[PDB]
Each structure stands twice: as structure tokens, then as C-alpha cells.
Amino acid sequence: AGMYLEHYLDSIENLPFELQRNFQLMRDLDQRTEDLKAEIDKLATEYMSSARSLSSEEKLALLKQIQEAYGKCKEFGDDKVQLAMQTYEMVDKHIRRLDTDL
Amino acid sequence: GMYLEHYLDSIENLPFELQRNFQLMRDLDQRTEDLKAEIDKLATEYMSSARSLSSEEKLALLKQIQEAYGKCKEFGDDKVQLAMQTYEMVDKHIRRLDTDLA
């Protein structure tokens, strides 16, 4: 399964093209975490904007927002890590080939 | 990590640890941005010369792309672990503060 695409992507001539492809997916995932991180930063600034006590409901509402943004950040991290692994493995396969050739 | 965990879970330490985690996150982002710039430069290099490249030259360049991606994935694990820790720490407070959960 995934056989034909794999054999096609196996040829080193295709490596720089697939790399560029993966670099774009990454840049896309990066834009999303940059956005979430902007949201967290605004939340942090709200939270930090005063030293006056917050009643438990007002603090709760902030924390849920902060948490939710972090939960989405973590998922995107999962996606970047996977993609990084996959790019790493692709390049590694060619490296092992050159090594045995050398 | 009992004593630190107790510290991380103390109510008064929440704002400090939250902001600290955010800065940890910013540092990690700086590291991956830098690496991605390196990777883009190497890939751009590879793409523009790969037809006339010897095995040695192709290896030296792919090895750098691989190394850079390897570091990126590990910085990626760091961000993931950091987002999860932040998520879980805030979650304790959310459960405590929510009249339903506490």
C-alpha cells in the first residue's frame, strides 16, 4: 500500500521537489502556531494587565482560553514533529544510499 | 520530581510559571525559525546544483539538511512537551475553579 507513490518518491531526482513540498506544509503549520501564540500572548497580557484579585469565574474564563489555545498548539506541534520525522527519514534513505556507495 | 511538581501546582506560582513557559516557547521558536532558514538555504542550494553534484558533494549537503531536520524535530518534541505541561498545569486550576469540577 502506498507503493507507487513510494517508488516514485524513491528516486533521488525527486528529492528536492518533495522537500520543497514538505517545506511548504511546514510553513503552513508554522503560520497557525504563530497565530495561536499571538492569541496566547494577548491573553497573557490581559491576565497580567492588573494585580487586582480576579474572582474565580473571571480567572476561570481566562485559563480556559489559555488552555484551549495551548491544546491547539500541542496538536500542531504533533503535526510538525511528524512532518519533520518524515522529511528526516526521506533524506536519510538517500544518505544511507550514498554512504553504501562511498 | 515531587518538589518541583508541588511548586508547579501551587496557585501563586501559576502566573510566573505560565509566563516562563511562554518565554521557553519563544526561545524554542527562535531555534526552529533559525534552522528552517538554514534548511531553506541548503535546499535552495541543493535544488540549484543537484544535476552536476558528485556523490560526496550530494552527501555533505544532504547530511546537513538531515542534521538540521533532526534538530528541528527534537525542538519540536520540546514544544510539544512544553505545550502539554502548560495544558496540564492550567487544567488542574480549571478543574479547581470550575464549580462543576470543583
UniProtKB/Swiss-Prot annotation, chain A:
GO annotation, biological process: apoptotic process; chromatin remodeling; DNA replication-dependent chromatin disassembly; negative regulation of cell population proliferation; negative regulation of DNA-templated transcription; negative regulation of growth; positive regulation of apoptotic process; positive regulation of DNA damage response, signal transduction by p53 class mediator
One GO CC annotation: intermediate filament cytoskeleton
Tagged with keyword Coiled coil: yes
UniProt keyword list: Acetylation, Apoptosis, Cell cycle, Chromatin regulator, Citrullination, Coiled coil, Metal-binding, Nucleus, Tumor suppressor, Zinc, Zinc-finger
GO MF, one annotated term: methylated histone binding
Domain-related comment: The PHD-type zinc finger mediates the binding to H3K4me3. The N-terminal coiled-coil domain mediates homodimerization.
This protein's name: Inhibitor of growth protein 4
Native source species: Homo sapiens (Human)
